[PDB]
Design an enzyme around this catalytic site. Structure first.
Site, short mmCIF file in Angstrom:
data_model
loop_
_atom_site.label_atom_id
_atom_site.label_comp_id
_atom_site.label_asym_id
_atom_site.label_seq_id
_atom_site.Cartn_x
_atom_site.Cartn_y
_atom_site.Cartn_z
N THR A 146 0.68 -1.27 0.27
CA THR A 146 -0.09 0.01 0.07
C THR A 146 0.93 1.21 -0.13
OG1 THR A 146 -1.19 -1.49 1.68
CG2 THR A 146 -2.26 1.05 0.84
N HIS B 166 -9.12 -8.65 1.10
CA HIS B 166 -8.13 -9.38 1.84
C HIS B 166 -9.20 -10.59 2.77
CE1 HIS B 166 -4.32 -7.33 2.11
NE2 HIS B 166 -5.14 -6.19 1.73
N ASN C 84 27.76 -1.14 -5.60
CA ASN C 84 27.15 -0.61 -4.61
C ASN C 84 25.53 -0.55 -4.92
OD1 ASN C 84 26.78 1.12 -6.56
ND2 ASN C 84 27.41 2.79 -5.38
N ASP D 72 23.16 0.47 -6.59
CA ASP D 72 22.39 1.57 -6.51
C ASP D 72 21.70 1.77 -7.89
OD1 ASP D 72 24.68 2.39 -8.34
OD2 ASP D 72 24.96 4.31 -7.11
N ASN E 223 5.25 -1.60 3.95
CA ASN E 223 4.11 -1.26 4.81
C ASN E 223 4.75 -1.13 6.18
OD1 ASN E 223 1.97 -0.48 3.09
ND2 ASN E 223 1.04 -2.63 3.41
N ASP F 3 27.86 -2.86 -10.95
CA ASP F 3 27.07 -2.37 -9.65
C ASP F 3 27.20 -2.64 -8.65
OD1 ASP F 3 25.21 -0.42 -8.75
OD2 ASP F 3 23.47 -1.53 -9.46
C1 LIG Z 1 15.75 7.51 -9.42
O1 LIG Z 1 15.53 8.86 -9.22
C2 LIG Z 1 16.22 9.36 -8.15
C3 LIG Z 1 15.90 10.91 -7.96
O2 LIG Z 1 16.69 11.49 -9.17
C4 LIG Z 1 17.77 9.12 -8.15
O3 LIG Z 1 18.14 9.44 -6.83
C5 LIG Z 1 19.27 10.40 -6.65
O4 LIG Z 1 20.50 9.89 -7.06
C6 LIG Z 1 21.57 10.77 -6.94
C7 LIG Z 1 22.74 10.03 -7.07
O5 LIG Z 1 23.07 8.92 -6.14
C8 LIG Z 1 21.71 11.46 -5.57
O6 LIG Z 1 22.47 12.47 -5.58
C9 LIG Z 1 23.37 12.81 -4.22
O7 LIG Z 1 22.72 13.66 -3.34
C10 LIG Z 1 23.25 13.95 -2.10
C11 LIG Z 1 22.61 14.81 -1.38
O8 LIG Z 1 21.17 14.70 -1.35
C12 LIG Z 1 20.47 14.97 -0.11
O9 LIG Z 1 19.57 16.18 -0.96
C13 LIG Z 1 18.66 15.82 -1.91
C14 LIG Z 1 18.00 16.75 -2.55
O10 LIG Z 1 16.79 17.48 -1.69
C15 LIG Z 1 17.72 14.55 -1.38
O11 LIG Z 1 16.80 13.99 -2.09
C16 LIG Z 1 18.51 13.36 -0.77
O12 LIG Z 1 17.54 12.33 -0.20
C17 LIG Z 1 17.93 11.05 0.13
O13 LIG Z 1 18.41 10.98 1.54
C18 LIG Z 1 17.35 11.52 2.23
C19 LIG Z 1 18.18 11.79 3.85
O14 LIG Z 1 18.41 10.36 4.18
C20 LIG Z 1 15.95 10.52 2.22
O15 LIG Z 1 15.09 11.39 2.87
C21 LIG Z 1 15.87 10.41 0.74
O16 LIG Z 1 14.60 9.08 0.86
C22 LIG Z 1 16.93 10.25 -0.17
O17 LIG Z 1 17.33 8.78 -0.09
C23 LIG Z 1 17.52 8.09 -1.21
O18 LIG Z 1 18.87 8.61 -1.70
C24 LIG Z 1 20.20 8.35 -0.91
C25 LIG Z 1 21.30 9.20 -1.48
O19 LIG Z 1 21.06 10.45 -1.49
C26 LIG Z 1 20.54 6.83 -0.48
O20 LIG Z 1 21.58 6.80 0.04
C27 LIG Z 1 19.17 6.44 0.25
O21 LIG Z 1 19.33 5.03 0.41
C28 LIG Z 1 17.65 6.57 -0.60
O22 LIG Z 1 18.18 5.62 -1.58
C29 LIG Z 1 19.45 13.81 0.39
O23 LIG Z 1 18.94 14.12 1.43
C30 LIG Z 1 24.79 14.41 -2.40
O24 LIG Z 1 25.35 14.74 -1.27
C31 LIG Z 1 25.57 13.33 -3.36
O25 LIG Z 1 26.81 14.08 -3.44
C32 LIG Z 1 28.02 13.14 -3.42
O26 LIG Z 1 28.44 12.74 -4.83
C33 LIG Z 1 28.77 13.93 -5.65
C34 LIG Z 1 28.89 13.57 -7.10
O27 LIG Z 1 28.36 14.32 -8.03
C35 LIG Z 1 30.10 14.71 -5.29
O28 LIG Z 1 30.09 16.07 -6.12
C36 LIG Z 1 30.07 15.06 -3.70
O29 LIG Z 1 31.31 15.26 -3.37
C37 LIG Z 1 29.24 13.99 -2.77
O30 LIG Z 1 30.26 13.07 -2.16
C38 LIG Z 1 30.30 13.31 -0.78
O31 LIG Z 1 29.41 12.29 -0.08
C39 LIG Z 1 29.60 10.99 -0.43
C40 LIG Z 1 28.55 10.23 0.06
O32 LIG Z 1 28.22 10.73 1.37
C41 LIG Z 1 30.94 10.70 0.27
O33 LIG Z 1 31.28 9.47 0.15
C42 LIG Z 1 32.16 11.45 -0.21
O34 LIG Z 1 33.33 11.03 0.22
C43 LIG Z 1 31.79 13.11 -0.25
O35 LIG Z 1 31.83 13.50 1.18
C44 LIG Z 1 24.68 13.30 -4.44
O36 LIG Z 1 24.62 14.30 -5.54
C45 LIG Z 1 20.30 12.05 -5.32
O37 LIG Z 1 20.19 12.43 -3.66
C46 LIG Z 1 19.05 10.91 -5.34
N1 LIG Z 1 17.97 11.38 -4.97
C47 LIG Z 1 16.72 10.65 -4.42
C48 LIG Z 1 15.55 11.53 -4.22
O38 LIG Z 1 16.94 9.38 -3.92
C49 LIG Z 1 17.75 7.71 -8.45
O39 LIG Z 1 19.32 7.44 -8.56
C50 LIG Z 1 17.21 7.04 -9.38
N2 LIG Z 1 17.23 5.61 -9.66
C51 LIG Z 1 17.72 5.09 -10.84
C52 LIG Z 1 17.91 3.61 -10.74
O40 LIG Z 1 18.05 5.54 -11.65
CA CA Z 2 26.35 1.59 -8.85
CL CL Z 3 6.17 -4.49 4.00
ZN ZN Z 4 -4.27 -4.63 1.35
#
Ligand SMILES: *[C@@H]1O[C@H](CO)[C@@H](O[C@@H]2O[C@H](CO)[C@@H](O[C@@H]3O[C@H](CO[C@H]4O[C@H](CO)[C@@H](O)[C@H](O[C@H]5O[C@H](CO)[C@@H](O)[C@H](O)[C@@H]5O[C@H]5O[C@H](CO)[C@@H](O)[C@H](O)[C@@H]5O)[C@@H]4O)[C@@H](O)[C@H](O[C@H]4O[C@H](CO)[C@@H](O)[C@H](O)[C@@H]4O[C@H]4O[C@H](CO)[C@@H](O)[C@H](O)[C@@H]4O)[C@@H]3O)[C@H](O)[C@H]2NC(C)=O)[C@H](O)[C@H]1NC(C)=O
Ligand code: CA
Ligand code: CL
Ligand code: ZN
Ligand code: YG6
Ligand code: CA
Ligand code: NA
Length: 806
Positions: A159, A265, A685, A687, A180, A683
């Site tokens: 859901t 259900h 990590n 991701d 859920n 891949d």
């Molecule tokens: C599906 O579509 C989505 C949406 O486009 C794709 O996801 C994006 O992918 C991007 C690449 O992985 C990623 O960009 C990174 O963002 C980091 C900052 O992000 C924060 O701010 C945004 C903006 O508002 C926010 O949405 C983010 O939200 C995540 O985390 C919060 C808090 O936990 C959660 O509420 C939320 O659910 C979301 O989680 C998901 O994403 C995170 C990754 O961000 C996962 O870990 C979770 O499991 C979950 O899946 C954030 O709050 C930014 O900091 C990153 O930058 C690093 O890399 C750049 C490269 O350009 C570099 O310049 C920098 O140096 C930096 O490195 C430093 O940090 C490293 C890691 O900490 C560290 O190792 C180094 O040593 C450095 O210190 C990066 O730009 C983007 O955030 C997500 N967005 C979402 C919404 O998920 C997704 O990829 C698509 N999928 C497919 C299969 O295509």
């Molecule tokens: Ca990867």
């Molecule tokens: Cl579940």
């Molecule tokens: Zn149901």
């Protein structure tokens, strides 16, 4: 502590909730125990029911009634939905013929056609046909508007994950709502259905439509409804909001029904008890449309009728118990049901070993109804791994089953005959989509598509720029009459080199041998031509893929195949070849069994070497262009070039060999030729995105040759299979896969048998979209076709599911 002593007079279903401790009068106050003392009395009236009767017509306004039949009701915005029908000789919307809506026909003051999302829980796709006789309003939306045979949900087909995917465009792994129920270890907190933690904002990532709207100055109807507020009151409140003044009226509204999920259900998807919930939903639709027609909005608003997921037959007796497999069953925590997720009961137990739990759950019973996986080994099409809330150990449960820890968990919890949650390619989990309105097409069927696509369309419908999401924006342009988004192809970032012959054989010291010295300008200018790309138009049908990141690579041409060879990863990123219906399979001649040949176009320092394979006792090698499909004995020598070689575990070579020797030919026979593009994926990590070189965790021992996590193939032909693949004038047909490059075949319980009994079943499970492969490779395919880019985006999102017809 709310000081619940304010009053809702004049504030009923107020659109900006008020901040504590002022009491609330919005549609969610019940759900926070925060409603003003008088909320029920003023805001949830029920007197006289929901329909006008002939003797209520022209009545004097009585403010106590749930809805009105007085003369002033239309302009107060608060008539019963059937007012004009009973009191003014009008017909119900469902009784009117449908007429194309070529332009929005809206009251003055409407800046844009409103969107109304009418969402239904547990509405399985086959209900549209199987319940058609009792859902006349829905059948009219469906057949007059735009509809798909079904809409694919996300995994897990639960859901909250699915509703929040509809809201955001994101996979659950990115939005955060991965079930859920969840445990987050960083917060050390749990998220559950009953209770308060689920209200905390930290669970909810991405940017849902109501926030996207608000930030860009489009007003949103507070979306969600306390469960006790009846359906009729929800509809009347929407209709009232739609009468607000221009500056206060929202542009986007949501309705949600807990039916038919709730009954499903209890009774199963096709229980005789299910007809009534389906009638009742249809009657609610009719109340909306009747109410829209009263406000002259029925040819103005776009309506989306959408479900989150389907429903399957599931009963208590089809439960597998981890207690029949694990001795150590009290050291684990299971998230149970139609999926399983396992973690350790305690962080302080260093005797907890995931490898041994997986082994004890693998192929232990003849008809075992679940299969364990480490999450990075789940099929990539599920996109279910890149979240700390997703436990490393996963059980994919067979349709019709449940998994539980111990039998006490079930009989001290048969209550239920339906459930959902299974693999999102299962037919019973499929759900519905219909769009009806000025912006949707007229009487149009579109192909099935995934619910991750809808956020972009809903943004298109409201004139919003979508936040980054996992839709492919433009892939659903064919649903729309106008407002289409005109996507453009990404620019190529790296251009290839075109190397000629530059190295003499003796400059290579790679430990490779081949029986090939066995030695006429008839066939000498000819092979020169082939190495310059004379046959390239045969084997590269849709142009070269574009590389969308910075790297160094070479195009290599051959009689039978073309590759883009990475000097950084020391292997092709892609290999492209066409196998005509007429093509014939040969064997690797005996003398040529272990033959690997240096590629005199590519330096030794950018080549793999045979010695590392010899020294690496776990790792062997295969070829991307298969020697079995060589056009001639002489061309076959090209398939043993060190530049066509890739690292393969022996276990995986069984799969790969069967695919290349048997299945490619079978596909060419069935599809009238196929174009194949194959290559590696990295891949590490998990991701879903291409690894950079510094992310690789495994190399062929003693070398810089990186080991792929997966191998892909994209298999394209003509949709009109009367035309051969290499001379197709119209739409294409594709199927693809991303096979996990695993050192065992533990995943396939029947793998000690001949490949013909198990390899195809594995490949089916690892079906993929071309878009999935794009994300994992940083390549962009189908760059030169005669087809519109929108249609190509649609093709790139297609998944071949192997399910029978709905
Ligand atoms: C599906 O579509 C989505 C949406 O486009 C794709 O996801 C994006 O992918 C991007 C690449 O992985 C990623 O960009 C990174 O963002 C980091 C900052 O992000 C924060 O701010 C945004 C903006 O508002 C926010 O949405 C983010 O939200 C995540 O985390 C919060 C808090 O936990 C959660 O509420 C939320 O659910 C979301 O989680 C998901 O994403 C995170 C990754 O961000 C996962 O870990 C979770 O499991 C979950 O899946 C954030 O709050 C930014 O900091 C990153 O930058 C690093 O890399 C750049 C490269 O350009 C570099 O310049 C920098 O140096 C930096 O490195 C430093 O940090 C490293 C890691 O900490 C560290 O190792 C180094 O040593 C450095 O210190 C990066 O730009 C983007 O955030 C997500 N967005 C979402 C919404 O998920 C997704 O990829 C698509 N999928 C497919 C299969 O295509
Ligand atoms: Ca990867
Ligand atoms: Cl579940
Ligand atoms: Zn149901
Ligand atoms: C998640 C939420 C933010 C959301 C987003 C969006 C929509 C609807 C939305 O929420 C509708 C809604 O009002 N409720 C969502 C459902 C939960 C689950 N549930 C349960 O406890 C529940 C219900 C069914 C179940 N089946 N199996 N387990 C179950 C558990 C009650 C609870 C009812 C309220 C639209 C589609 C309009 C657009 C995007
Ligand atoms: Ca070896
Ligand atoms: Na096996």
């Amino acid at each position: 502590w709310t000081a619940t002593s304010g009053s809702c007079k004049g504030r009923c279903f107020e659109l900006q909730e008020v901040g504590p401790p002022d009491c609330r009068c919005d549609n969610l106050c019940k759900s926070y125990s925060s409603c003003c003392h008088d909320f029920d009395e003023l805001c949830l009236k029920t007197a006289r029911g929901w329909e006008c009767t002939k003797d209520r017509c022209g009545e004097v306004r009585n403010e106590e009634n749930a809805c009105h039949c007085s003369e002033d009701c239309l302009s107060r915005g608060d008539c019963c939905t059937n007012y004009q029908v009973v009191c003014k000789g009008e017909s119900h919307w469902v009784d009117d013929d449908c007429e194309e809506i070529k332009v929005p026909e809206c009251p003055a003051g409407f800046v844009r056609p409103p969107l109304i999302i009418f969402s239904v829980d547990g509405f399985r796709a086959s209900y549209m046909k199987k319940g058609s006789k009792v859902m006349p309003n829905i059948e009219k939306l469906r057949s007059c508007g735009t509809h798909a045979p079904y809409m694919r949900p996300v995994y897990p087909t639960k859901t909250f994950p699915n509703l929040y995917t509809l809201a955001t465009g994101l996979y659950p792994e990115s939005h955060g709502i991965v079930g859920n129920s969840m445990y987050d270890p960083v917060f050390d907190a749990s998220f559950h259905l009953r209770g308060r933690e689920k209200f905390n904002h930290r669970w909810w990532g991405g940017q849902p439509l109501w926030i996207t709207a608000t930030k860009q100055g489009v007003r949103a109807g507070t979306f969600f409804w306390s469960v006790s507020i009846p359906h009729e009151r929800r509809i009347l409140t929407i209709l009232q909001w739609l009468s607000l003044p221009d500056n206060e009226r929202p542009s986007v509204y949501a309705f949600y029904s807990e039916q038919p999920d709730f009954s499903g259900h209890k009774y199963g998807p096709f229980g005789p008890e299910m007809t009534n919930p389906l009638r009742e939903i249809d009657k609610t639709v009719g109340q909306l449309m009747d109410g829209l027609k009263q406000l002259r909005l029925h040819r103005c608003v776009n309506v989306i009728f959408v479900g989150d997921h389907g429903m399957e037959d599931v009963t208590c007796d089809r439960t597998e118990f981890l207690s029949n497999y694990l001795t150590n069953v009290d050291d684990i925590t299971l998230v149970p049901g139609t999926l399983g997720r396992i973690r350790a009961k305690s962080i302080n137990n260093s005797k907890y070993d995931p490898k041994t739990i997986i082994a004890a759950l693998t192929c232990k019973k003849p008809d075992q109804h679940f299969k364990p996986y480490m999450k990075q080994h789940l099929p990539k099409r599920l996109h279910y791994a890149n979240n700390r809330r997703i436990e490393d150990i996963h059980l994919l449960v067979d349709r019709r089953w449940h998994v539980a820890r111990k039998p006490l968990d079930v009989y001290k919890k048969c209550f239920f005959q339906g459930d959902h949650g299974f693999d999102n390619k299962v037919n019973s989990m499929q759900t519905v989509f219909v769009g009806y309105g000025p912006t949707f097409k007229y009487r149009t069927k579109v192909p099935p598509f995934e619910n991750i696509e809808l956020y972009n369309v809903m943004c298109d419908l409201l004139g919003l720029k979508p936040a980054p999401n996992n839709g492919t924006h433009g892939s659903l342009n064919h649903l729309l009459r106008t407002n289409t988004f005109r996507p453009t192809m990404p620019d190529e970032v790296s251009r290839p080199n075109y190397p000629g012959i530059m190295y003499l054989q003796s400059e290579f010291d790679l430990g490779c041998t081949c029986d090939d010295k066995v030695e006429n300008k008839l066939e000498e200018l000819n092979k020169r031509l082939h190495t310059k790309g004379s046959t390239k138009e045969r084997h590269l049908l849709y142009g070269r893929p574009a590389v969308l990141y910075r790297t160094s690579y070479d195009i290599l041409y051959h009689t039978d195949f073309e590759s883009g060879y990475s000097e950084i990863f020391l292997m092709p990123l892609w290999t492209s070849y066409t196998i005509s219906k007429q093509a014939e399979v040969s064997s690797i001649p005996e003398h040529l069994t272990n033959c690997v040949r240096p590629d005199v176009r590519v330096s030794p320092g950018f080549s793999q070497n045979c010695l590392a394979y010899k020294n690496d006792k776990q790792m062997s090698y295969g070829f991307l262009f298969p020697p079995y499909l060589s056009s001639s004995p002489e061309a076959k020598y090209d398939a043993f070039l060190v530049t066509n070689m890739v690292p393969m575990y022996p276990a995986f070579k069984r799969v790969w060999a069967y695919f290349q020797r048997v299945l490619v030919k079978k596909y060419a026979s069935e599809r009238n030729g196929v174009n194949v593009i194959s290559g590696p994926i990295f891949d590490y990590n998990y991701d879903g995105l291409r690894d950079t070189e510094d992310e690789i965790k495994q190399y062929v021992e003693g070398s810089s040759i990186p080991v792929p996590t997966h191998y892909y193939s994209i298999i394209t032909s003509c949709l009109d299979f009367t035309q051969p693949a290499d001379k197709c004038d119209g739409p294409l047909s594709v199927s693809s896969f991303i096979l996990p490059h695993r050192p065992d075949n533990d995943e396939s319980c029947n793998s000690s048998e001949d490949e013909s009994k198990w390899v195809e079943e594995l490949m089916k499970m690892h079906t993929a979209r071309v878009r999935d492969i794009e994300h994992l490779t940083g390549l962009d395919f189908y760059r030169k076709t005669s087809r519109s880019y929108s249609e190509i985006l649609t093709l790139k999102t297609y998944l071949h599911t192997y399910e029978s017809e709905i």
